[PDB]
Amino acid sequence: MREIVHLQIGQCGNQIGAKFWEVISDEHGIDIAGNYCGNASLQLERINVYFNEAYSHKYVPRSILVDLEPGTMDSVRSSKIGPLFRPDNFIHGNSGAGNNWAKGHYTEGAELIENVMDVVRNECESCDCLQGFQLIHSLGGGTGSGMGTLLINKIREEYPDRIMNTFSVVPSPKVSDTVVEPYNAILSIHQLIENTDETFCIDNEALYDICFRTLKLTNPTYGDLNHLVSLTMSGVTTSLRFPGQLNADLRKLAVNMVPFPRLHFFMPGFAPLTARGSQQYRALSVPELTQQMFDARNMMAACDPRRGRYLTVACIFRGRMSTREVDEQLLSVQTKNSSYFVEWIPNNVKVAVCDIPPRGLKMAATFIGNNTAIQELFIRVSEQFSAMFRRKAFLHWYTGEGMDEMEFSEAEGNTNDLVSEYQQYQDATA
Amino acid sequence: MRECISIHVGQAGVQIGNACWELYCLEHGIQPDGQMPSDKTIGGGDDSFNTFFSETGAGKHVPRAVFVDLEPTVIDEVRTGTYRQLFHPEQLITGKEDAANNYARGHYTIGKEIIDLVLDRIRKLADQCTGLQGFLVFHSFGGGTGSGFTSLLMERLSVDYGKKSKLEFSIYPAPQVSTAVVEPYNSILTTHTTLEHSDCAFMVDNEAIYDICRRNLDIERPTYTNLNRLIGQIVSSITASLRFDGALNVDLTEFQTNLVPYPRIHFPLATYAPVISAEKAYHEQLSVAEITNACFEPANQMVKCDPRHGKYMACCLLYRGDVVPKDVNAAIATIKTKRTIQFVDWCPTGFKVGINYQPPTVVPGGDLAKVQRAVCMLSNTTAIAEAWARLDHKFDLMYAKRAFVHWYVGEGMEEGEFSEAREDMAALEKDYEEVGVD
Ligand SMILES: COc1ccc(C[C@@H]2NC(=O)/C=C/C[C@@H]([C@H](C)[C@H]3O[C@@H]3c3ccccc3)OC(=O)[C@H](CC(C)C)OC(=O)C(C)(C)CNC2=O)cc1Cl
Ligand SMILES: Nc1nc2c(ncn2[C@@H]2O[C@H](COP(=O)(O)OP(=O)(O)OP(=O)(O)O)[C@@H](O)[C@H]2O)c(=O)[nH]1
Ligand SMILES: Nc1nc2c(ncn2[C@@H]2O[C@H](COP(=O)(O)OP(=O)(O)O)[C@@H](O)[C@H]2O)c(=O)[nH]1
C-alpha cells in the first residue's frame, strides 16, 4: 500500500493546505474528530495515501505544517482543522524569513531542516511503502519558497528514489505589494527545475483574474483564492485518492505527463469554478464542462493555451456522468482542435471518470495539462526579475546572507533556458 | 506425460488468467473449492486436464498457475474472489512497488528484486510435473510489469528451461482503454526482448475486443469485465485442443509446428464467429458454413488488421460443440472458391480442421450467450505486420524528439536499446514483407 507524505511550508502553503485538507475530509466523509462518517465504501478505499489510520479508526492526515512563525499554526489551530492534524507535526521557528529567500534557504531554513527532517523520517519509518512527497508552498515569500526548495533538496538527498510533487503558488503584483517576490520566485523556480519531478503551477494572477472577471468580486480576498486552489487541488488528486482506470499514482502520473525532465510544470484547471455560496445555480452537463475545461479564462495559470501546444493532458471528470458521452466529447475536442495538441506524442489526452463529486457540485471536471503556454508565466516572472535585477534593487538583503550574486544570474539563465526549451518543443513539428 | 505452467504477469495477465481459470473450471466441471463431481471418481491424474489442474491427495484440483504482479491489488482481488482456496498462497506473488508503466523499471530495477522468488516458485511447480512441455505467459504489451518483468522472465526461462517451448498470450495496446502514453515504448521493447525467447505468441488487442463487444454485445461502454470475459472465452477455446482429447494441437510443439515456420514469424491470429449477446440467445441458430465465413470475416478477428491484403501460411480450424464433420468440408470448399485467401508458394496444406465434441460453456451472468456451435481459427498470416507497423509508427513519432526517454535511461537502461529495438522491429517488418513478397 502506497502513501504520500504531505508538507505545507509558509503562510500560503499552510492556509491552502488547511482548506485542501478540509475539502479532502469532506469528500472522504471524515469529520474533524478523525472518524469516518460517509455512506460509500469507495471513500474508505485508497485512504492510506493521505490519511494516517491510527488505532480505533482514527484518520489523522500525514501533513507536516511548517513555518518560521507560530502565527499560522495558531490560525490553523483556531479553525476546526487544528484538532484534526497531528499536534506533533506542527513545526514553527522564532522569526519569519520576511520575504527573503536567502534567509529562508541559508540560515533559518538551514537551522529548521534538522527538526523537519526528523519529523519527515518519523513519518517515513512507519510506512509499509512510500509513494512520494506532496508539497504546498508559495514561491513569493521567504519561508515558503526558500525552506520549500531546501526541504526539496534535502528530501531528494535522503530519498532519491521517491517522486517529488509540488503545488507551487507563483506570486503576482495584483495580489501582493512586496517587490522582491520575483527574486524568491525565480530562485525557487531554478531549484524546482533541477530538483522536482512534478509541479502544479498555480498562479495568483490567474486566481485574481478568475475572481475579478468570472466571480464578480470587487475585492478578492485570500479566502476566495484559497477556495479556488482548494477546489482544484481536491480535483487534481482525485486520481490518487480513488481507484480508477487512469489511476496515475504519482509515479504513473509523472510517467504519463512528463516527456522531458525539465518540462514538468502542469497547468491545472477546474471547469465549474464558482464562488462560495453560489454554486447551487450552475447547470451541469458534459459538453459545457468540456468546453469550460479548456478555457483560458477558466484555467488556473496566467497563460493562453491557444498560443501553445498541449504536450500531455490528463482530464479527470468527477460526478455521475456517462463515460461514452465524456469520451465522445473529448475525442471531438481533440479532433476538431487538433492544431492545439502535439502530433509527435500520440494519444496524449487521457480521460478518467470518478463517480464521487466534490461537495456542493453535482458534476465537476478537473484538468491537468503539460501545456507549452506556461512559458508565458515564466517569461512574466523572469521579466519582472530582470526589471528588478538590471539595476540591483534589494540585492544587499540577499548578498548579506551569504548568497553570491552569481546565483541570481544562474537562476535567470536556468529559467530562460527552460523558456527556450518550451519554445523549441512548441516550434518543432513531426 | 504433458504438463503446462500458466504464468500471469501484470494486471492484464492476472485478470485475464483469473477469467481463464474460471472458464477452465466451468468447462471441466471443477468445483470452486477444488473437488470434482464426475472425474474425481477415478481419483488419479493424466485425464488430459492434468496438463493444467494438478490433483492433490485430498482431491483438490489445484491449477498449475503462477500469478505475478509488482502490485498487490489484483492478487488480493483473486485472493478474495470465488477461487480464493483454489489457488495456493505460495504461487500468488505480490509486490511492494509497481513498475509504473515503465519497461526499464520492470526489467532492470523493480523486476530484478523479485525475479528469483518467481523463478523459485516456477521451479517448485516444475518439480511436481514429470512431463512438462512449457509455459503459457499471460501479459500485456503496454504496462510496466507485463512488458519488463515478462521479458526478464522470458530470458530466465530460456536460460533455465531451454528444452521447453513458451507460448504467450499478450495484450496489444488500444487507445480506447489505455493507462499510459508510453505503451508503444514498452511494446516495442518487450517485443524485441521476447522475440528470441517466445515460440508462439497470440497477441490480442483490446481495440478488436472493444469493437466486438460494442457491435455484438451492444455495450457502448465496455468495462474490463466484459473484455476479460470475452478474451477468457477466446483463450479457453484456443486451449480447448490442449486440455481435451487428441485431434490436433495437442502439444505446445504441435502449436509450434502447425502454425510457426520461422523463429521470428510466430504471431498467429485467432478469429471467433459466435460472439452473440445474451439477449439474442433464442432468435436463431448458426450453421457451420456461416460460422466458417465469420471466422474468415476480417471484422471478427482478435487483431484489428486485414488478412486479405496479406498471404496466409496456416489455418487450424478448431470446432467446438456438436459439429458434424460432413458440412465442414463443404464450408472449406466454399472458402477455397473465394480466392481472397491466398496461401504462400510452398506446399500450403490447408485448413487443418479438428473437431472437439464438448459443447462450449459460457459464464453464467456474463454477456456471452450459450451456443451449440463454436469455432476458433488460428491463422498465421502477414497481416500482423500492419499491427507492428502501427506500433513502430507510434514509436517513431515519440522517438523523433526523444520524448519520455529519460524515464527509461534513469532506471538502468541504455539510450541505444531504443534504437536496437527499433531496428529489430524494422527487421521483423522486413521479414514479414519478404514472406509477403513472392
Ligand atoms: C507455410 O508454413 C506451413 C505450411 C504448412 C503447415 C502444415 C503443417 N506442416 C508442418 O507442421 C511441418 C512441420 C515440420 C516438422 C518439424 C520439422 C519436426 O521436427 C519437428 C518435431 C516435432 C515434434 C517432435 C520432434 C520433432 O513437424 C512435423 O513433422 C510435425 C510433428 C508432429 C508429429 C508433432 O507433424 C506435422 O507436420 C503434422 C502435425 C502431422 C501436420 N503438420 C502440417 O500439416 C504449417 C506451416 Cl507453418
Ligand atoms: N483485456 C484486458 N486488458 C487489460 C486488463 N487490465 C489491463 N489491461 C491492459 O493493460 C495495459 C497496461 O498494463 P497494466 O494494466 O498497467 O498492467 P501492468 O503490465 O502490470 O503495468 P503496471 O501495473 O504499471 O505494472 C492496458 O493497455 C490495458 O489495455 C484487463 O483486465 N483486460
Ligand atoms: N493564493 C494565495 N496566496 C497567498 C496567500 N497568502 C499568501 N500568499 C502569497 O504567498 C506569499 C507569502 O509567503 P509567506 O508564506 O507568507 O512567506 P513569509 O513572508 O516568509 O512568511 C505572498 O507572495 C503572497 O502573494 C493565500 O491565502 N492565497
Residue numbers in the entry:
A (entry chain B): 1 to 430
B (entry chain j): 1 to 438
Article excerpt on this structure:
TUBB1 expression is critical for platelet biogenesis, representing 50 to 90% of cytoplasmic β-tubulin, and defects in its function lead to congenital thrombocytopenia. To achieve this, we took advantage of the ability of Cp-52 binding to induce the formation of stable tubulin rings that are amenable to single-particle cryo-EM to solve the structure of α1/β1-tubulin.
In vitrified ice, ChET-Cp-52 rings have a diameter of ∼22 and ∼32 nm, corresponding to ring species with C8 and C9 symmetry, containing 8 and 9 α1/β1-tubulin heterodimers, respectively. The asymmetric unit of the ChET-Cp-52 C8 ring comprises one copy of α1-tubulin with its bound GTP, one copy of β1-tubulin with its bound GDP, and one molecule of Cp-52 between the tubulin subunits. The ChET-Cp-52 C8 ring structure presented here shows compacted tubulin interfaces, causing it to have a smaller diameter than the HeLaT-Cp-52 C8 ring. Specifically, the intradimer interface is more compacted than the interdimer interface, with differences of 1.8 Å versus 0.6 Å, respectively. Although more residues are observed within 4 Å of the bound Cp-52 for ChET than for HeLaT, the overall arrangement of the binding site looks similar.
